[PDB]
Ligand binder design. Structure first.
Ligand code: HEM
Ligand code: NIO
Length: 143
């Protein structure tokens, strides 16, 4: 896979934007997932009763999902490939994890980065994350 230095530089800087206010931006992330995938609270316990900003898991889970996706960009840049941990592959083997759902999560994350970067947003930025995620998602899908 073709992932450039500049693409990584973008992924990194937008991620730091995220990390500036994870509390704020994680709300966006889950609000989005539930609007598009309402079954998603049967799966995610901490979302059982809607988006609970008091639940500490909400920001833990989000920081960890965003970071992994960054890691990927970093990997594509380093190795031209992405590798997924065994455990991450094992939990996503459940039937709730469908192609249609990969989209939802994806659109939710780009939606969250946007709000995080503001006017610094562009197709270019959207594309590097896009790659980062899609390359990881496949790395999960069978690994
Ligand atoms: C590239 C896309 C994805 C990434 C990076 C990702 C990342 C993660 C991470 C980091 C965890 C573990 C969190 C923890 O407990 O600390 C996890 C678990 C999980 N993921 Fe994702 N995931 C992705 C796609 C999906 C999709 C499309 C679905 C379908 C709804 C999904 C459903 C789940 C479920 C049900 C769990 C287990 C819940 C639990 O923690 O008990 N994931 N995933
Ligand atoms: O909260 C999580 O752990 C989560 C949310 C979406 C996709 N994968 C994992």
């Amino acid at each position: 896979v073709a992932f450039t230095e500049k693409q990584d530089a973008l992924v990194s800087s937008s991620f730091e934007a995220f990390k500036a206010n994870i509390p704020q931006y994680s709300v966006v992330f889950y609000t989005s997932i539930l609007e598009k995938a309402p079954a998603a609270k049967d799966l995610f316990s901490f979302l059982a009763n809607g988006v609970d900003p008091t639940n500490p898991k909400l920001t833990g889970h989000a920081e960890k999902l965003f970071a992994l996706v960054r890691d990927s960009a970093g990997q594509l840049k380093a190795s031209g490939t992405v590798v997924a941990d065994a455990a991450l592959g094992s939990v996503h083997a459940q039937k709730a994890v469908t192609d249609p759902q990969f989209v939802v999560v994806k659109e939710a994350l780009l939606k969250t980065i946007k709000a995080a970067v503001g006017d610094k947003w562009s197709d270019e930025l959207s594309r590097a994350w896009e790659v980062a995620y899609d390359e990881l998602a496949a790395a999960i899908k069978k690994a």
